[PDB]
Amino acid sequence: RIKRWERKDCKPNSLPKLHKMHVKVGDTVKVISGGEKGKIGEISKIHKHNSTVIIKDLNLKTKHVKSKEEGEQGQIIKIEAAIHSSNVMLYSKEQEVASRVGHKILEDGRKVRYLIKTGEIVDTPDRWKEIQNK
Amino acid sequence: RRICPFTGKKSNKANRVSHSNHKTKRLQFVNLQYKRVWWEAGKRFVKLRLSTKALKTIEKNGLDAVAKKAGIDLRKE
Amino acid sequence: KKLKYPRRILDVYQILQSPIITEAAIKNIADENSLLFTVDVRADKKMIREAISNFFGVKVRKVNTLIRPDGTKKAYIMLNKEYNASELAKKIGIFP
Amino acid sequence: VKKEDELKELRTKTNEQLNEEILQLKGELFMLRLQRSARENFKPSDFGRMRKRVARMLTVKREREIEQGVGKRLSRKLDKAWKRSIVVRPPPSLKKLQEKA
RNA sequence: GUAGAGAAAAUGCCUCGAGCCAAUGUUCGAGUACCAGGCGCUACGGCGCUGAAGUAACCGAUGCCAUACUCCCAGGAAAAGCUCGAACGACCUUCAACAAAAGGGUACCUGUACCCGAAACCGACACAGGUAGGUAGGUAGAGAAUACCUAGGGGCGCGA
RNA sequence: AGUAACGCAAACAUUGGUGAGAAUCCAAUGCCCCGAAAACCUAAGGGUUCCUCCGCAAGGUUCGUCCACGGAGGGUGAGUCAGGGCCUAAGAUCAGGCCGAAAGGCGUAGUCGAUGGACAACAGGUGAAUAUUCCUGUACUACCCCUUGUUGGUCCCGAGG
RNA sequence: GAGUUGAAAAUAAGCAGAGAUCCGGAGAUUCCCGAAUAGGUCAACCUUUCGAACUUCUGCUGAAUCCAUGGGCAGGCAAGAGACAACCUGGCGAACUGAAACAUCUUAGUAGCCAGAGGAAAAGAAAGCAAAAGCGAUUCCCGUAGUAGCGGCGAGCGAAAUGGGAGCAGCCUAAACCGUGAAAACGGGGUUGUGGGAGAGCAAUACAAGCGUCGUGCUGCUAGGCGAAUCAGUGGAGUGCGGAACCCUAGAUGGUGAAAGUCCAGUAGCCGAAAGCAUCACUAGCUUAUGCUCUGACCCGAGUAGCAUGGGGCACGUGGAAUCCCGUGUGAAUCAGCAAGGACCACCUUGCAAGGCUAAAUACUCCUGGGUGACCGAUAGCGAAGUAGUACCGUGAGGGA
């Protein structure tokens, strides 16, 4: 499968080298580049080696699956393919605008993310607990 | 080895030359003897190999001076 | 005279690695009342006899070791005639 | 929060208690190894939990020994000693429940 | 048994002993073992069931006694276990050690498959070759030669 | 050049079977060859080639349903058999010791070193692949345990063997 | 600061905002082989009375032999031992080759081999250069100079002083003498050269300078964080094109479906260290210290210098052959001396051998971190962009895709 040189880069201690990227899992984003350009969605899975994200209704690909179990029954399934994290911008549903993202400090002793075209804060205090229970 | 303990002499590396000028590797050796020497302060002999210059120096300065400069204990000898 | 040194220094809890369950072993249980255990290579017979005699609380007749071509010691433990094999078979989860 | 708890618990015990504890744990580890091969359902996570628990225990043990002022060589001698005197006892955990049954 | 510095030994003197040796043989082991056949099933591969007689003579080893003899010159390993034993030295000592005939108990590692007059080792090959040792049936034959056979194994990895 | 060759002049034959496919794989019946081996076993070596199920790309001088080939899963059980826990030969290393520009060379006690000394097990059965190893019979070594009998035993040393 | 349990999916279970996985500092564990080190061995095993063998260390014990030596016993986290590309020092030390042959000479004190230590090593504080004028330890670069010379006067080899730079740094000890002993030792004194010190008297005394546990200090390194500015159209995808905008203490770089200052990670700029490391300052303390006069009687590194021989090395091949260093043998002088100044002698000048130690400038790349490249782009670049020192070949050293 994997082209032998396209495998995961490594540190001396054998662990893969992760790209640090600007988005988390529960986020809503809009897609700037690609054929999926303009569409809005929310993020499902994220791979921190390739730096690629997967979004539920976007980048659908038609995959043939052969299930041979005592009969021959095939399936035509539509899956979602990863799309590069640098093709998406964080989207504000409220003023309905996609922006870049800065960091800011909250008086709680906290560090969070905000959109710089509004000043709307992104991260909610229980966000992780909101997604874990899903 | 061919060495004197006391004066620390070495064999010396020297050419034998001919009348025809043709040089040759050769060794000149320390003149060594197996001597018993008298040690007065131990009231006894000591068996050694010695250069003869050592023997001289032992006549001149006494055995203990020589051995102490050379760091060799006459008891362990 | 002195403390009895065990042939090597091992840690007994690691020596019996596992029961070997295949068609072969099970009928050895049936016939011979003998369990089959993959054990540490560095481990001996006296150590296996104490280990299993204390662990499952059974008196053991005789032990026979083996070394696979893969370097993994394999031990036949044939128990006494008193303690049935199939007993320990249901106790361990080996089902004849 | 289990790690911190368990360590506080550990650092407060005595030496003999630690030893004994260690032994019991290693035995449970054994019985676990038996279940794996028996193909009786169990928890993969358990090997990790236990093995690492043992780690933590030994760590603490050696750490105290360092304060006592003992070297590597003395350590390893007393270790051969203690591994010599080890006798297997059946794991209190699951073997005692087949002694009762 | 004695004698010499002399326990045992060696050596010298005295004494007691007619038997001794060892393959093999008899008996137990050993029979409700094994086995010709017989009965029944056939997944027709193999299987369950019951079992008669089980002695004698003549050939005869290169094997055994056997380092047994006889002869020869070229004159044919060491050390431990083993048997015996005072002085010297060291260490250990009483329910401790040693000595015995029964009885019960107890049981260290490593090899172990397969091939090995070879398609598996050694020859670059699934190569007309090399490779220590053991076992040695029948008829003819002086014979381990030869010819034809048993047990067992094969019909040579291109055919027509 | 679709040429030489296909590795002895022991020899194959037919009927079935499996299979998409058989001169070549399986079985039966004949015939033929070896039989001081072309038989059975063990040393060394090889290293999983052994057994079962699947496969037929490459390997196999043709074929191929087959294989010492490829894939998966198994298989080697010892107080007595062979080595080690015993002893030494040739030879090796060699404390101290002797010598040597250095590395090292010689060499004593010691310690290694079997192809030799010492030392205890056989019959039958099971058996996809192990058996003097597993099972049933009778055995035998070495330790420990008790009873009894003695009081010194152990090593170093002296000897017979 | 959010998801995670290597490459590496899948499955099974966990661990996780009371902070996981992850990154950095300090510790812990570390089977068996290997210096290998309890004894043995056919490396990765065996046997064991469980032992770091042996050599140094501390203690107890005490052969032949009185003191001793040797040996025995014990203590001890116990000093060493091994590994290490090139560079370096020391030891052994070639030959092909050049000379159009070859032997002196050259190659070359090169390679190789052995031993040794360091981040550099070695050398180094004038018994030195020079020439009648002067310098002021060593090393390295430029130059003098292919000059003086050496040489079967053939092949060839080949300086130095003046001059310019880099870089700078000077110190301990022996002896006379005074203390303690029977010694051998220990303690003070004492270290220099157009002479010093010991000896005998009289003055000055406080600053200066050098070394350094402990510790907040300063800085840097080892994790990090904050970080400006864009939209739509164009045929798979736009960073390109046409058209509009903006940032810049940031237009380094890598990625992104297609070439991006403005999409991502970043860059400038600016913040950050509980722990360890490093250079620096400070740091109690420890060190030292001057001045003059008289005295040729006392010292100033002995089997040494030199001499005779045999060599070696110095650019210098025995030459008129100094200086330097060694075998054999002889063998001085102490400052009214001794050595050097290219045989040797006189005179003058310069210096003080036979005891040590010392940083920098210089050499190097198995490497680490940054940077650049008129460097390669799968026959190239490392032998190796996949099992690469692998497969395979060789008894082995070794070869090697």
Ligand SMILES: [Mg+2]
């Ligand atoms: Mg692919």
Ligand SMILES: [Mg+2]
């Ligand atoms: Mg079996």
Ligand SMILES: [Mg+2]
């Ligand atoms: Mg182990």
Ligand SMILES: [Mg+2]
């Ligand atoms: Mg075995």
Ligand SMILES: [Mg+2]
């Ligand atoms: Mg006698």
Ligand SMILES: [Mg+2]
């Ligand atoms: Mg007598």
Ligand SMILES: [Mg+2]
């Ligand atoms: Mg007699």
Ligand SMILES: [Mg+2]
């Ligand atoms: Mg007869």
Ligand SMILES: [Mg+2]
């Ligand atoms: Mg004969």
Ligand SMILES: [Mg+2]
């Ligand atoms: Mg024969």
Ligand SMILES: [Mg+2]
């Ligand atoms: Mg005879």
Ligand SMILES: [Mg+2]
């Ligand atoms: Mg006695």
Ligand SMILES: [Mg+2]
């Ligand atoms: Mg007796």
Ligand SMILES: [Mg+2]
């Ligand atoms: Mg077998």
Ligand SMILES: [Mg+2]
């Ligand atoms: Mg066999």
Ligand SMILES: [Mg+2]
């Ligand atoms: Mg063939």
